[PDB]
Amino acid sequence: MNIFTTSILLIFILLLSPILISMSNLIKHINFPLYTTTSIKFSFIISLLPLLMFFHNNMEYMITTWHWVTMNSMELKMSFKTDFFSILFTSVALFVTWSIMQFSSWYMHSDPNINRFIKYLTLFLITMLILTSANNMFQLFIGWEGVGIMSFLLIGWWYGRTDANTAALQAILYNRIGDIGFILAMVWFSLNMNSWELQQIMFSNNNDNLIPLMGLLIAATGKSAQFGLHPWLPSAMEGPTPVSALLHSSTMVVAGIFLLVRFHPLTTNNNFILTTMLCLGALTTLFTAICALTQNDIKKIIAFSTSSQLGLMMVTLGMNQPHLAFLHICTHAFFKAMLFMCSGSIIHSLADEQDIRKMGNITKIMPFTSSCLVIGSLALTGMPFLTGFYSKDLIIEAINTCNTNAWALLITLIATSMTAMYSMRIIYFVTMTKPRFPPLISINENDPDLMNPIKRLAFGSIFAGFVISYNIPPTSIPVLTMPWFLKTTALIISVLGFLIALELNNLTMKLSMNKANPYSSFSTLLGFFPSIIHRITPMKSLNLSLKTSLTLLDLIWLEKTIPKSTSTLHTNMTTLTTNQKGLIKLYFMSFLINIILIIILYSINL
Amino acid sequence: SGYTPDEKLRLQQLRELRRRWLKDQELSPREPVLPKNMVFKAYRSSLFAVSHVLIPMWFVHYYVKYHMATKPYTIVSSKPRIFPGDTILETGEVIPPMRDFPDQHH
Amino acid sequence: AFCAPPAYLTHQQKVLRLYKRALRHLESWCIHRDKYRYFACLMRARFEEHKNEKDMMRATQLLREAEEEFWQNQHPQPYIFPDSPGGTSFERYECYKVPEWCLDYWHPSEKAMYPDYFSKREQWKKLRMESWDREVKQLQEETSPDGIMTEALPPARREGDLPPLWWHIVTRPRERPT
Amino acid sequence: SWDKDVYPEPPSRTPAPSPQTSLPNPITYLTKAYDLVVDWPVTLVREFIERQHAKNRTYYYHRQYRRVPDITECKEGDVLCIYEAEMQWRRDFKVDQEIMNIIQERLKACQQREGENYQQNCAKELEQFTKVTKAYQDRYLDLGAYYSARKCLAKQKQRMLEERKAARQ
Amino acid sequence: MLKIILPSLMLLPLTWLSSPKKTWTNVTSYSFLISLTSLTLLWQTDENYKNFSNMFSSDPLSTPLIILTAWLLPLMLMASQNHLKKDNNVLQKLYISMLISLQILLIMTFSATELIMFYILFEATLIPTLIIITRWGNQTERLNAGIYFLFYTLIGSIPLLIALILIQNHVGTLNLMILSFTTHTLDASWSNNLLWLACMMAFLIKMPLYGVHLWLPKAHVEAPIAGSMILAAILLKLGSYGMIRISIILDPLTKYMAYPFILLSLWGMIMTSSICLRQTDLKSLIAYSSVSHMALVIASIMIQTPWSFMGATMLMIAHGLTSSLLFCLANSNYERIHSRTMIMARGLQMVFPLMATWWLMASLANLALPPSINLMGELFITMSLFSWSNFTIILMGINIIITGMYSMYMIITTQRGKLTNHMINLQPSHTRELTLMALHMIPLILLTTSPKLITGLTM
Ligand SMILES: CCCCCCCCCCCCCCCCCC(=O)OC[C@H](COP(=O)([O-])OCC[N+](C)(C)C)OC(=O)CCCCCCCCCCCCCCCCC
Ligand SMILES: CCCCCCCCCCCCCCCCCC(=O)OC[C@H](COP(=O)(O)OCCN)OC(=O)CCCCCCCCCCCCCCCCC
């Protein structure tokens, strides 16, 4: 009981230690990125210890480490609900972040603020662990906005870039709408159950939770970039590649999905919530796969891959399968960490060049990165017995075998086929064909700081799904008695997508121009949602603000109503009352009128 | 068309001054004027493990055992799984076994 | 960047700009090098076919129709170089392009950390002191009495003289400052 | 320092280890190393601290207030006994707040202890919580920010009058 | 309370008898000691109220305001040290005397046990703010701004005086605890409705309520830094304290006379957040942010939930600290560039990294970052407002969204982006102003660490 809590809070202490070293004025004498990388790997080992303990005895833990404040009949206490989800995501996130910071030490070389970057990544990791392991909604909300703000800073890392600042601002906006949904849910639970404690939420499982479930759904939509609130993720690709990987690929984007997994006992009792979660997830994975089919920037392609897999998780949470969603969280975290790290190595070797139209012959010129990229693409598509086979295939069988929306099922299968097709597009236009990059060869991937995190993430993306899924305690009973076309559905549609995209890429190789069609224009131009919404909603908002609020109300009509009207009235009265001609004749006539008036009031008063 | 002679001469003079400025941006070899390794397993990682882990582990263990277990409901854990045929360590009673399992086709 | 835009773009300049934009969008569509070379040779053949026009009103109409076709058949995501506006590395290092006048505000200890570079810095400052009045006189002398003037600037017209307004051009921060 | 009379906890029932496999248990190995490296020096330091405490031991007492006359036997306008009854009421209000906190911690501890059986084995804790929140809603709800003994008495009198009117039929 | 009032009173002979090369040092150090002495009012080991005398008392609500004022006075001297360096010694000592008079009269105002004494000290505090804004303001609109501020506040405060004298004649003593104990219900007649409006509108002007908020932006813009601090951090909260003190004797008709002011506050914080989005002046933008935050305070105080009163208290203290910090950062930029334009200075993250860090933490406190007392105030106000009516969450959500937008718009257009390289008159940093930002931001961290001090009367 002591070693478990000591290990968890030691993970937290080892996370907070490089921040104190950063503010303790000894960075100029030590190697801060290497020190932080060693700190994260040690945090991963002391995180591996309760992973083994929970895999043995399945002990479920609550730790109240610090009583913050007692507020009549409501105690805000800093507490951790050490879950299965909390333990496994802690281990996976620490392993991934160790890989990302080693890759960051390689990639952010010749950068004046490499220590600033490393400290920002560490602070983001601390906030993400707070969000993941938090027991009460206030602490989870602390983690939520800490992650959001550090995402803002890391997107606007290159603060001299107007596009980076704009992308960070709109990421803040969509995360803020998610925060509004979270605040609605938090306030409803505070009013109806006197606490933000998940135990009292579990006791709240047996009533109508429609309003707080709607709030949590809005919060998860904002955080996980589902449809309506999606484009902040592909805009958030603007920042550096390790930020892209760690933030937008593995840890932050699955926070809303993680929140839904946390509130899954409430989710199971509301059928309307389950149906709208399923429909929203199917729509967003279909739309994001459609967008991913025709992008040219490799980071944008794998970002829309991230959003489509998040839509798959959101579908899985539309089903009563939260543990499958969390397994896909860990699986997806591994895949996108390795894929993004490979893409960043490609970009650095090709000198900050990002779109796939100026790449090629990568299999021959960068064999290690090519092999790891092929591993990531195959395992993301769902090659059997890799890490993705133990989550994605079970999701496909679950949606094929349980009662769902038919259109959601169909577009989920088509989205999986599109996942195969854009993975083929990545493989073809990067690792195949002839070179298209500028001639000067500056490729040097022989750095150990580059190779070793990709090796660790390759071992993850090969074996971690198998090891984890065989170590999961049995829950959410799958169905295995099912027809052969339903059983091999995911593999069949993945092979079909690979073949279709291969022949389409060969048709692009064929020497003929074709007139573009509105389907490809819709897919390449982001579905027109960013252009249309980001032009009409800010214009109406700021136009209403300036034209009505400030100008009309404050600078015109409240001034015309109270103060200038009072001043004008008193000015008119004082001019009218002291426009005196200065004649004693008129003054004495006025005095006579006053005398007559006072006699009249005396006569009427008596 | 091409360069007019005035702007051509201006760019040549400006570029020559740019060459001079960029050459003057160089650093002399004395600038800036500033005012037990063993093996990695035995000193690089061992000292880190015994310094930045062991003392924090001591402090956390002290705080956990002497400021959380002394309080009632700080560390609350679920009941462990109890199976038939198991022996309870704390109580000492053995759980009776299951029924006869009529289906053994697989 | 190093030359100021004129009052208007001529027809020949507009034709060249349309040709370059059309070939860039053609490479964005074609991707493969042999395919782009084939279709770019076709586009060059089209431009050479419409090259010899004398009426010039028919040429303006042809230019309008050609750029209308270009706007109909332009790539939704044309290829942009990373340093180009709208690219990925555009304005990435403006956060590192620190202007040179902060060395005037540097502490004497930080100045003593780099003695020779700072000594060259006051040599450059003294040269600027000596050249400013002469280049102001040159700018006042070479200004035309008419209201016509462009944004172009004169060069130095004699020995021992510097081009007018040379400081912000010569002492600009590097595009790779670190 | 805490007592099971006010923080009830069922006795733990852990099963004996029955390792079918022949592989060593890394949790047991790391736990034994963890005690031998960490727990022994920590308990040595705490024993030194505790014997220093025993060398310099001091005592403190829990303050108790006698019952002043309640606001019902208290004349209006006579602000002395108004004040005494009002601060007694505020003290009892704070005590009831902490009683609510105690019951809420009991409910949370029950839910975390039972885990998957919380819908059945936490019936007594949920019943106690429901009864105490019904009593709290009867005595302190909807008083406002300027809650007082007079407002609580008015609300109680209104509730009693409503109950008496409903008890006629 | 006398042990805090008397040495603050004796600060004035120290100011007028100190050497011209020692006046700032002596007054700043001794006012820091005044704040340290004023920290003793937090010794509340009992539910009983600290009634020091028949005239002065301390309260769980009055104590944080007194400590805040005593803390801002040395910070006020620090901010006023720079723009008076080219100024006469007699006028410097006069300005220090005006600030010390503010600090003294505000401690007596918050610690007064009598509402008529509270009113006397209310516009006794109004006078030196007028003098500071009118004499040491920079632009030509300072005279108009002083006229607007004074006459909004006095046309508010006259019916408050009539209502106070009527309450004194009706009850007998107007003592706060006697009123709180022998509070009598109102008959919900027209006379009682007009009396309620008379005793409410003064504090509603001082808040300021939406529609009558027009004196605040121009006074904050044309005011000096110490005037901006005293207004945005003490005087609005003084109107807050006035409503909290006066609302006890207004039952039951406040439950329906609260209706227009709640709507005005919610729609007005939305309106002023929109103005913050489309505002071209930094001081104006911070002023309208202050108007929105005090509109939240109005909504909480008028819905009269205990959770709402607590959220109003924590929002009082948190918004005072973060608004003073925001005005300090704006004034540092103003003393750098001699301009107040929002868009003119852009890339200050490059030249001033530590000041941009202070900018970032100030804006994060402004936009309610967890677990700060700012967000605790807004979240508990949100909870109480949703309890009052479930459809308030839409207006709260719009307000919070636009709040995040204007805070990040501040950060992006004042720190991020390319540097305006033509501003060669950018001195690196003063240790004085960096110390000013640190002394503004550290108490926010400490009150975040321990939020039980500023919970207020209800809990
Ligand atoms: C800043 C806001 C300015 C505008 C609003 C001003 C306040 C509006 C509400 C209060 C009424 C006016 C002030 C009266 C103060 C005393 C109230 C009181 O005691 O009420 C109970 C009393 C009644 O006392 P009573 O309770 O004893 O009633 C008798 C009851 N029996 C018989 C049963 C015992 O109400 C009044 O006497 C009110 C009469 C007011 C008449 C004069 C009003 C003049 C104009 C005022 C506003 C001027 C400034 C703004 C002009 C426009 C600017 C754009
Ligand atoms: C089957 C069911 C389907 C259901 C579908 C439901 C869809 C719901 C959609 C809800 C959200 C819609 C509004 C989103 C607005 C986003 C605005 C934004 O951030 O735009 C960014 C834009 C510039 O960015 P961009 O154009 O993308 O990139 C330029 C790169 N050079 O512009 C900017 O950066 C401008 C900077 C900000 C200006 C101020 C904005 C203030 C907005 C206040 C909004 C208040 C009301 C919010 C209501 C939310 C309701 C959910």
Ligand SMILES: CCCCCCCCCCCCCCCCCC(=O)OC[C@H](COP(=O)(O)OCCN)OC(=O)CCCCCCCCCCCCCCCCC
């Ligand atoms: C939503 C709520 C709605 C309800 C509440 C509404 C009321 C809110 C509070 C009222 C605020 C009023 C503000 C008045 C001052 C602003 C006007 C002003 O500044 O006017 C200046 C002007 C003189 O300007 P001057 O300096 O000469 O020249 C310009 C530059 N040299 O001045 C003039 O020309 C004349 C100024 C006269 C003095 C004005 C201040 C005193 C007003 C007394 C009002 C009495 C009302 C009752 C009268 C009896 C009944 C009819």
